[PDB]
Design a protein around this ligand. Structure first.
Ligand SMILES: *C/C=C(C)/C=C/C=C(C)/C=C/C1=C(C)CCCC1(C)C
Ligand SMILES: *C/C=C(C)/C=C/C=C(C)/C=C/C1=C(C)CCCC1(C)C
Ligand SMILES: CCCCCCCC/C=C\CCCCCCCC(=O)O
Ligand SMILES: CCCCCCCC/C=C\CCCCCCCC(=O)O
Ligand SMILES: CCCCCCCC/C=C\CCCCCCCC(=O)O
Ligand SMILES: CCCCCCCC/C=C\CCCCCCCC(=O)O
Ligand SMILES: CCCCCCCC/C=C\CCCCCCCC(=O)O
Ligand SMILES: CCCCCCCC/C=C\CCCCCCCC(=O)O
Ligand SMILES: CCCCCCCC/C=C\CCCCCCCC(=O)O
Ligand SMILES: CCCCCCCC/C=C\CCCCCCCC(=O)O
Lengths: 280, 280
């Protein structure tokens, strides 16, 4: 069923593998199961769901960040639906790895844009500062190292994962300051509840990715690839759809505030944050 | 010599390939030559050279952008020197592709940081605006599509390359406005010469990458992988080392200007640019 060699004969009491000279690549590790049909189904359902609300979110939705990830997201399901396990949505490499490049490519496409969104939670500003650049670079870095880790094996996989981890820690800390700052920047009411919710959504969801990597085929293989897919789809849901929804909601709330009360700032000490207020 | 299967027997008048059942992956396309020994040598020399001046640049060199790419750059040579063709510095995939993930990973790590630098050529500002974010997203996008294109074959490779191309065009246009703006922002003298030089360095160098892709194994294979390596090393030199040098030079010049004359702006019309001037 694959576009690589899946059919083969064992010869010489299993010491030889004979293959059609058909120009197809071959490897046993590639034929290993992606997981149970139940996990498969759980995976396909969740994908349809995230596709469904990515479409719903897109229908419903500058605010460009979230339409951008929703566009990437439903683009990705289009690929998943038709080619999820075709090279190179999955990369079957010469070391036997199956690396879900669809996932890592998606992260590359969406994470910086989420971080850009995070860097401007209010949506008001020509915000972007040095912090934001660090957020972006550290995060692209973690994805590159993680992807490299996924593509690797043994010690070097460990090294790259650890490099990704160091970049990730840097990203989380940076994101945290941003969330802390945003909390004190936005109006005292509901806006601070959703910033808080976004922080939670963000750190749990984003923190789950290295956990999933550790658990997945790229790690200690406690999760099958379907299992990994299931997990990733849940935290995709959280990190892309739910977070972006809150983020959109936060922005609507800020705008409505800005519209009704004007844009009024009172300096608060943390670095200094220009807090939104209702009155003079 | 490779960590995949390179040794094999043709059986049944060449219709069967028999392989040791040793758990190694096998594919004929992987064994195809990387190129001539001359191209190999040209490649190894150029790599040592860029390594050498990346070290020299690093020794010589916030100005964080250029130390960051120089760090990535000499990190990459460390890998190249030891593992250039080992999975996954090169990805040998089940469709037969050899995809130079070292290169694409490097681009992911360095290009946004170059673009961040470009977005703040003077080094003065807490610059970063919406434009910069577009620069970053479009460029990460072109690399993702190009990498995906490299990993792919036929029509889908064409599609992704074309998607990368569309993102790239967007990036070039954006970069152009930035260069245009920077030219009119920096002091009238030598600072505008190097901005001009940087623009040239940038558009020629960066424009050569899709050309190289088109010419390379990922494209119409007019260049061998060594040939591709040679080409990429030249435009790496241009885009990373030479550009960053100019960029560093530009910043030193701006600072010296700022120090001597102060920071004095006169608004010029293009969008409005706050031009650096020497006197009131
Ligand atoms: C929508 C997708 C998102 C928000 C993905 C985020 C992914 C990460 C934060 C990945 C992090 C990783 C580490 C922190 C360690 C290295 C391995 C990774 C790539 C899984
Ligand atoms: C230091 C490395 C640099 C500056 C690399 C830049 C690479 C590009 C601008 C690649 C561009 C591509 C396209 C514009 C079309 C799609 C294929 C690519 C990825 C080669
Ligand atoms: C975001 C999407 C990034 C790329 C994922 C790779 C998908 C390529 C599918 C082609 C498979 C095929 O048609 O044979
Ligand atoms: C872990 C190592 C850190 C990698 C993060 C790189 C961030 C550089 C940009 C920081 C900044 O100047 O804003
Ligand atoms: C450090 C945390 C885990 C990194 C993931 C690597 C897990 C084991 C490596 C062995 C292998 O996967 O081939
Ligand atoms: C949120 C966390 C997701 C956990 C992923 C585990 C998937 C279980 C399917 C086997
Ligand atoms: C920037 C560097 C990104 C990753 C390139 C992949 C290099 C991995 C080398 C490991 C090869 C090996 O030791 O067998
Ligand atoms: C070609 C398609 C365009 C991809 C570029 C995406 C850039 C989005 C950000 C633009 C911005 O609002 O600054
Ligand atoms: C459009 C410009 C070229 C994109 C590169 C694809 C070149 C031919 C595709 C066939 C193949 O490489 O398998
Ligand atoms: C600058 C352009 C680089 C051109 C690359 C061609 C490499 C020639 C080696 C064969």
């Amino acid at each position: 069923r694959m576009l690589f060699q899946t059919s083969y004969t064992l010869e010489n009491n299993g010491s030889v593998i004979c293959i059609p000279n058909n120009g197809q690549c071959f490897c046993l590790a590639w034929l290993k199961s992606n997981g149970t049909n139940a996990e498969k189904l759980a995976a396909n359902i969740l994908q349809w769901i995230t596709f469904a609300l990515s479409a719903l979110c897109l229908m419903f939705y500058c605010g460009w960040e979230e339409i951008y990830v929703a566009t990437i997201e439903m683009i990705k399901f289009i690929i998943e639906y038709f080619h999820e396990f075709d090279e190179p949505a999955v990369i079957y490499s010469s070391n036997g790895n199956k690396t879900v490049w669809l996932r890592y490519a998606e992260w590359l496409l969406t994470c910086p844009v989420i971080l850009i969104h995070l860097s401007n939670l209010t949506g008001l500003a020509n915000d972007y500062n040095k912090r934001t650049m660090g957020l972006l670079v550290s995060d692209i870095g973690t994805i590159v190292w993680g992807t490299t880790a996924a593509l690797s094996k043994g010690y070097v996989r460990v090294i790259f994962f650890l490099m990704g981890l160091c970049y990730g820690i840097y990203t989380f800390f940076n994101a945290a300051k941003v969330y802390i700052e945003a909390y004190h920047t936005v109006p005292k009411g509901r806006c601070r509840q959703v910033v808080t919710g976004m922080a939670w959504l963000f750190f749990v969801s984003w923190g789950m990715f290295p956990i999933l990597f550790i658990l997945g085929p790229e790690g200690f293989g406690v999760l099958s690839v379907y299992g990994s897919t299931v997990g990733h789809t849940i935290i995709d849901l959280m990190s892309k759809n739910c977070w972006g929804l809150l983020g959109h909601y936060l922005r609507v709330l800020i705008h409505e505030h800005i519209l009704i009360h004007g844009d009024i700032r009172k300096t608060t000490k943390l670095i200094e944050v220009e807090t939104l207020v209702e009155d003079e």
